[PDB]
Every structure is written in structure tokens, then in C-alpha cells.
Write a protein that binds this ligand. Structure first.
Ligand SMILES: *[C@@H]1O[C@H](CO)[C@@H](O[C@@H]2O[C@H](CO)[C@@H](O[C@@H]3O[C@H](CO)[C@@H](O)[C@H](O[C@H]4O[C@H](CO)[C@@H](O)[C@H](O)[C@@H]4O[C@H]4O[C@H](CO)[C@@H](O)[C@H](O)[C@@H]4O)[C@@H]3O)[C@H](O)[C@H]2NC(C)=O)[C@H](O)[C@H]1NC(C)=O
Length: 534
């Protein structure tokens, strides 16, 4: 007899699944949490879902949000994609389990909640929650005015957190013990939820894996320039912002999503998108965010709940791993370094054009010693990209939360290299380039063909899940009993305490005065964070 739950909008029938270690759990997939954002509701904030008649089939995951998938080089999914997936080993309203919510990555351009299998997590007494939010121009169009204020896809997320608060009890989750977690755009997304009034009081604690809302690729400074370009590529007449959004509302969703890749200086190898979170205009009704993330954070405006944030030793394998796919790509980066530095390091909009030559030469000086880009300099290219894109702003996230929150704030550096890496998928080889962006996450979740059953990988899976469970219950994150105590970041210290996770059996407390080599990246004159003005 298949598992059944009533939620606010009606009755769900799910499936019975098995955890990694042979335990039964209830799985409810393809649960709608919002009206389909279709027709006049393309680009608009999520609308309330009208209750459904009869029993809704929650046995299968439903379509991912319509997206440019750069790995498959196609448009895939559907406009009808606002689906949540809820997994419980205790299907009982009185179970009151910690709730682990996961916001997927994909640079706000691609991905899906349904790619992340919760088999490992279901060997613990938590409810796991994955979900879809609108992506690319569908999720993040902005004309910088009431026509398209921006952040639709973050409003989808907030709406999903609101849905979890109102409905997770029926799956045996404690709404008052939600652990909000995410990776890449999802980690940035967790940080965005700390900053927004919309998500205040809707999570007890956070984990931002390899992502912060302070990172340039997570934030659009010139949305109206992006919207006009998209509209022009698609043959929409330029005139009023009203006419622009109206023409985009009536073009096929597939034409609007696919067109983004044809924009001028579109991210090299399509690993990021200009359709990202932005600052919504002043006086926007129920805005997600009306001020630049750094100014909200430094005013102490982040929600006062604990935080784990984290990076891997070779973060830059996103995107640098895709550079190994074609053997011509490193030679192309060498030949065109001066034009493409502002691209791959994502300061297209936050540095004057006349300053690009200068900054390009400083980056090549600092990390490559001015050597040509090649297989020999690949590791330094990876460190450079990982520092700029992920590690620096993860360090600022940890420090600024530790500084303002009055709450335990933890940092980890993951340097365990297991059987498999995300580099395998992105490079299409089995070469070891170190520990990629998301190689820790691929131990918590099963991602298609990036799951291992080696003894050492299985132990890391247990350790990282013990980190989430211990953080969600006691509040003191602990991977193993033998590990030295994980110390929080000291409020107001120039020094950042982090757990260095070399392996499941080897981790110790370390310290950086210059996390991600911030002193270098802060000195290049990017109009970001400490240097931001209107
Ligand atoms: C990265 O940063 C760089 C540096 O700022 C950005 O580069 C700017 O890119 C924009 C285009 O996105 C470009 O703007 C064009 O400038 C020209 C000035 O000579 C204009 O001719 C051109 O106008 C057309 O396009 C507009 C929309 O982009 C329309 O609103 C306008 O009506 C024009 O439309 C005509 O032409 C189109 C085809 O182009 C046609 O289909 C229409 O029907 C119509 O006939 C733009 O305004 C800037 O010049 C660039 N600046 C520099 C210095 O290079 C870049 O956009 C950023 N990229 C990302 C991804 O963020």
C-alpha cells in the first residue's frame, strides 16, 4: 500500500524507497508548491497554487525548469517545473524530525532538485527536501523597474521554504528545525535567504557549500542591459521596458532560454549566466532584496541563526575542468587571455573596459608567474578561478556572519579526493586534477554516475551526514568521535579558524589570515563588496 499524505493543496501518493543501508522511507516527488509560471505569469513572482482534485501521483520526479544545459548543449525541461520532493523515514505528524532542505547548483542557469538522490541521508532521522526554482531569464529577468523587478527564482525558493514551514509536519518534519543547505548557486542562494525579509524565521540554521551571495557571478549589476540584449537577439522591438517584457512573454519559452548564449561576451564555455539575482527597485512590493548583499550583511542584516560554509581544495575545476574536454581550449585561453580574463573570472560588469588589460596582467603575474596557459600551468589556473569565484567570498561570508550574528559560524576546507570527481563529467576523462567544486556534495547526495561504494568514500559519506545530523540536533558539528573538536570562527578576528578535512580519519583545526588570497583579489579595483557604489 503506497504512502499517502494530505498537504494544504490536497492528497499525495508517493513510493517506498530504500536508504543506502537497507532502511525503508517514503518518497513524495513532483509535488507542486506554486501555480505553473506560464502565460501572463512568466517572469512574475510565484502565485498561490489552487488545490487539486483527487490524488496527485508523487511516485516519480516531474520536469526540471526550462534551462540551457551547457553539458548537453540543448534547451530541456518545462515552464511547468515548480516541484518539491520530500523524503521521510518516519511518515507520522508527531515524529518532529530535523528537516534538511537542499537548493541545487548550476550557476542559476541549469540543474534540478530531482538530480539529488537522498538515499544516504535516509539512514538518519531527518526529512530531506529537494526542489526546482526558475532559472536563467525565466527566473532572473530584470528591467530594473516595475515591468520586471528581478529575483523571481529566489522568490520561488522563498515560496518553497514557506511551503515546507506549512506542510513538512505531515511528513514528520519539525518546521522549527529546518537546516537550509545548497551548493554553487545553491550556496549563494542560502546566503541570499539569510539577507531577505521573505525567508526570515523559515530556517533554524544554514550550510552554504562553496557559494556566497558576495560572489560576482551570483549578482547582476546591469540587468536592463542583459534584458535589452536578450530581447534584441529574439527580434523583439526595443522601446519601453513594458514592450520588452511583453514581447518576451509571447515568444516561445524555448527561444527565450536558448537565446541567452548568443549575448555579447556570454560566459566562456557557458558555465555561468548573466541572468542572476539582482537588487530589485525601491518600493517593489514583497521584494526578495532591495539592497546590495554586502551593504545588508555589513549593516548586520543577516538572520541570526548558525552557519556552516565551506570550499574544496580545487574549487576552480568549476569551470576549469570543461577546459580539458577539447584539447584546443587551453591554447585558446593563452592566445586570448587579455580579452577573456574579465570573462572566466566574472568581472565583465564590475571593472571599466579600459582597466581589463591591467587586471589580466596582474592575475597572470600572481598565479601563473606570467607563464603561458598550458597543461603545465593548469593547476595554478584552477587555484586562480577557485580563489576568485568561490573561496574568497566564502571566507567573507564566514567572517561577516561570525562578526554580526552572535551565532556559531563554522568554516571547512575539503581536500579529500575519493574514487570519483565532478571533473570526470565536465572533462569527459578519469584524470585526477584534485578535489573539484561539489566533490563533498556528491558524498551527501547520489548524483547520476558520480556516486562511489569504495570503503574510504562510504566513510566520508557517513562523516558528512554526521556533520549535518549533529549540526541539526546538538548544534555542534562533528564528522567523527576521534576528530579534534571543530572550533567556530572567532567573532571579529582577522584570523579564520577552519576544519581542514584531508580524509574521513584525518582532520585538524587550521587558520588563515588571507583566505582565498583575498588581499590579492580585493586590490584589483573591482566595483564589488568593500569597493561597491551606485
Ligand atoms: C559584458 O560587458 C560588456 C562591456 O560593457 C557589455 O558590452 C556591451 O554590450 C552591449 C550589447 O549587449 C552593447 O550595446 C550595443 O551598443 C551599440 C552601440 O554602437 C548599439 O548598436 C546596440 O544597439 C542595439 O542593441 C540594443 C540591445 O542590445 C537595442 O536596444 C538597440 O535598439 C539596438 O538594436 C538594433 O540592433 C540589434 C542587433 O544588435 C537588432 O537586432 C535590433 O533589431 C536593432 O536593429 C547596443 O546598444 C555595448 O556596446 C557593449 N559595450 C562595449 C563597450 O562593448 C556586454 O553586454 C556584457 N555582457 C554580459 C553578458 O553581461
Amino acid at each position: 500500500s503506497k504512502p499517502v499524505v494530505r498537504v494544504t493543496q490536497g492528497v499525495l501518493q508517493g513510493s517506498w524507497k530504500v536508504s543506502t543501508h537497507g532502511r525503508t522511507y517514503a518518497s513524495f516527488e513532483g509535488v507542486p508548491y506554486a501555480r505553473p509560471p506560464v502565460g501572463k505569469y512568466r517572469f512574475r513572482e510565484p502565485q498561490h497554487l489552487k488545490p487539486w482534485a483527487g490524488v496527485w501521483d508523487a511516485s516519480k520526479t516531474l520536469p526540471q525548469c526550462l534551462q540551457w544545459d551547457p553539458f548537453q548543449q540543448e534547451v530541456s525541461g518545462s515552464e511547468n517545473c515548480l516541484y518539491i520532493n520530500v523524503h521521510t523515514p518516519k511518515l507520522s505528524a508527531g515524529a518532529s524530525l530535523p528537516v534538511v532542505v537542499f537548493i541545487h547548483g548550476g550557476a542559476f542557469m541549469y540543474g534540478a532538485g530531482s538530480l539529488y538522490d537522498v538515499s544516504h541521508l535516509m539512514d538518519r532521522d531527518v526529512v530531506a527536501v529537494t526542489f526546482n526554482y526558475r532559472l536563467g531569464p525565466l527566473g532572473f529577468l530584470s528591467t530594473g523597474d516595475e515591468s520586471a523587478p528581478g529575483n523571481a527564482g529566489l522568490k520561488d525558493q522563498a515560496f518553497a521554504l514557506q511551503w515546507v514551514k506549512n506542510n513538512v509536519m505531515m511528513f514528520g518534519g519539525n518546521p522549527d528545525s529546518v537546516t537550509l543547505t545548497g551548493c554553487s548557486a545553491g550556496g549563494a542562494s542560502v546566503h541570499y535567504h539569510y539577507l531577505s525579509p521573505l525567508s526570515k524565521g523559515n530556517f533554524a540554521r544554514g550550510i552554504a557549500f562553496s557559494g556566497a551571495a558576495f560572489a560576482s557571478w551570483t549578482h547582476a549589476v546591469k540587468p536592463l542591459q542583459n534584458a535589452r540584449s536578450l530581447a534584441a537577439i529574439v527580434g523583439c522591438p526595443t522601446g519601453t521596458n513594458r514592450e520588452l517584457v511583453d514581447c518576451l512573454k509571447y515568444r516561445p519559452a524555448e527561444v527565450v532560454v536558448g537565446a541567452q548564449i548568443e549575448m555579447l561576451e556570454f560566459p566562456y564555455q557557458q558555465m555561468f549566466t548573466p541572468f542572476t539575482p539582482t537588487v530589485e527597485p525601491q518600493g517593489t512590493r514583497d521584494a526578495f532584496l532591495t539592497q546590495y548583499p554586502f551593504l545588508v550583511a555589513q549593516a548586520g542584516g543577516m538572520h541570526k541563526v548558525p552557519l556552516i560554509t565551506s570550499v574544496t581544495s580545487e574549487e576552480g575545476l568549476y569551470p576549469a575542468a570543461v577546459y580539458q574536454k577539447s584539447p584546443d581550449t587551453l591554447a585558446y585561453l593563452e592566445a586570448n587571455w587579455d580579452q577573456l580574463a574579465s570573462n572566466i573570472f566574472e568581472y565583465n560588469d564590475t571593472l571599466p573596459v579600459n582597466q581589463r588589460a591591467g587586471v589580466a596582467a596582474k592575475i597572470k603575474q600572481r598565479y601563473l608567474g606570467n607563464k603561458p596557459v598550458s597543461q603545465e600551468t593548469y593547476p595554478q589556473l584552477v587555484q586562480a578561478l577557485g580563489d576568485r569565484l568561490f573561496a574568497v567570498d566564502v571566507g567573507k561570508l564566514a567572517q561577516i556572519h561570525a562578526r554580526h550574528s552572535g551565532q556559531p559560524t563554522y568554516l571547512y576546507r575539503y581536500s579529500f579526493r575519493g574514487e570519483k570527481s565532478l571533473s570526470n563529467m565536465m572533462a569527459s576523462n578519469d584524470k585526477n586534477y584534485g578535489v573539484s567544486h561539489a566533490d563533498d556534495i556528491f558524498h551527501i547526495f547520489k548524483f547520476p554516475s558520480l556516486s562511489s561504494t569504495s570503503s574510504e568514500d562510504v566513510r566520508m559519506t557517513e562523516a558528512l551526514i554526521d556533520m549535518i545530523y549533529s549540526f541539526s540536533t546538538t548544534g555542534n558539528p562533528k564528522l567523527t568521535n576521534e576528530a579534534p573538536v571543530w572550533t567556530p570562527v572567532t567573532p571579529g578576528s582577522a584570523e579564520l579558524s577552519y576544519l581542514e578535512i584531508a580524509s574521513p580519519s584525518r582532520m585538524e583545526m587550521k587558520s588563515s589570515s588571507d583566505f582565498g588570497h583575498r588581499s590579492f583579489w580585493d586590490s584589483l579595483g573591482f566595483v564589488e563588496n568593500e569597493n561597491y557604489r551606485h
